[PDB]
Amino acid sequence: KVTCLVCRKGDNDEFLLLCDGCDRGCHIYCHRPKMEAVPEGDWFCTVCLAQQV
Numbered sequence: 001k002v003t004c005l006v007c008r009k010g011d012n013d014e015f016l017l018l019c020d021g022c023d024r025g026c027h028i029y030c031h032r033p034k035m036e037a038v039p040e041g042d043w044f045c046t047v048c049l050a051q052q053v
């Protein structure tokens with residue numbers, strides 16, 4: 001179900017970041033700036049960042 005925002009594939013799911021604000025995702029290797037690992041705690045996608053104040 002989860003696909004990457006940048007490349008639109010849902011493969012290599014161990015490399016797939018999952019947004020804590022919605023159901024969107026992103027391969028760590030697709031992200032810019034460089035992300036060498038899935039972080040702990042919370043990651044927010046760009047659509048969620050746009051809802052912050």
Ligand SMILES: [K+]
Binds near residue numbers: 021022048
């Ligand atoms: K939300």
Ligand SMILES: [Zn+2]
Binds near residue numbers: 027
């Ligand atoms: Zn990707």
Ligand SMILES: [Zn+2]
Binds near residue numbers: 023024045047048049
């Ligand atoms: Zn999100």
